[PDB]
């Protein structure tokens, strides 16, 4: 068939190269995701810009060193390693390894002056039960870090929000000690608003949600070429709607990729629980039917963040959204519910196996 087909959240590929056979299903096929590989770089940037804007006061003991402690989530997990590498490279403490204990003396500018940077300690947070990204171990480690390093700690850095909020639960957390996380969880963004957590990082789920719906509307409304991926996304559409977060377009892979955004005192209100893009308003237009797929009904992120975003923005773009969800293990749990395709004007597919692009395009021929 020749209807719009927007893959999202999981990019068609070998589980490593993009499945360009799927992407070229037709000239109305796209992918929507986010700039994942650069996530660590953005956390690092946030931390560097914070220090750059700081006075000499952030150097608590005034030894000309910016000392930090690092919460590692999982030494074998890609997201942990990317975020560790991201902040270590940014601070110049990177040696080629994301492992704990593997850092060198670094450098960073504070108030126009060069400071040494030392990773006082980086530690994997693991529970007694073996569970990783462990919040309780973070709380305990933070408490011990205060006792051991005391005024040497100038900031705390964490692979995620969960562990960072764990650190803030330490009964002896030094008052006003800067600390940074990652994920932009609700409680984390709230903390940023209260001036406790210093920063975190968002993948902009809302931007991704709107982009899926906007690409579809642009296509069904008769747009072609640059308009399809720009209107309502990186510039206002005919109605004035426009995604607020920055978004990229990767042409060779037909991918609309939201930036990773840092979340600080400067913009936390835009990322709090239930916050929605004020740049996307109700449109007066004919209703269009969209069948949307979810690879796992039990996935917390898709269930708690992505789907609710989709359901909020869809009626504003006059999209009648029908959602079907799989179990998370077999591709059939989605394909079976991927029927009645003659009833819909467009399709958004989130498959469990990235290489299963051909299974869906086959059903689009009947
Ligand atoms: Ca110091």
Residue numbers in the entry: 11 to 25, 28 to 378
Q: What wording appears in the published article?
A:
In this report, we found that TpMglB-2, the product of gene tp0684, is very likely the D-glucose-binding protein of an ABC transporter dedicated to the import of this vital molecule. The overall fold of TpMglB-2 resembles those of LBPs (sometimes called “Periplasmic Binding Proteins”) that serve as receptors for nutrients and cofactors in bacterial ABC transporters. LBPs generally have two structurally similar lobes that are attached by a hinge region. TpMglB-2 has an unconventional topology for an LBP, but retains the hallmarks of ligand binding and ligand-induced conformational change that are common to this family of proteins.
Purified, recombinant TpMglB-2 readily formed crystals that diffracted X-rays to a minimum Bragg spacing of 2.05 Å. The final model after refinement featured excellent geometry, and 366 of the 387 residues present in the construct were visible in the electron-density maps. The large cleft region is solvent-accessible, and thus this structure of TpMglB-2 appears to be in the “open” conformation. The first is a calcium ion, which is located at the far end of the lobe, about 30 Å distant from the cleft. This cation is coordinated by atoms from four side chains of TpMglB-2: D71, N73, D75, and D166. The Ca2+ appears to stabilize a loop on the C lobe while simultaneously adhering it to the main body of the domain. The second small molecule is located in the interlobe cleft in association with residues of the C lobe; it is BIS-TRIS, which had been included in both the crystallization medium and the cryoprotection buffer at a concentration of 100 mM. Hydrogen bonds to hydroxyl groups on the buffer molecule are provided by the side chains of residues D91, R95, N172, and D195, and an additional van der Waals interaction is made by the side chain of H89. Although this site likely overlaps with the ligand-binding site (see below), the fact that TpMglB-2 adopts an open conformation with this small molecule bound suggests that its binding is adventitious. Comparisons of the structures of TpMglB-2 and EcMglB also reveal a stark difference in the proteins: their topologies are circularly permuted. The hinges of Type I/Cluster B LBPs are usually made up of three regions of irregular secondary structure representing points where the primary structure crosses over from one lobe to the other. The permutation noted above in TpMglB-2 necessitates a fourth cross-over; this region of the protein (residues 284–288) is close to the canonical hinge.
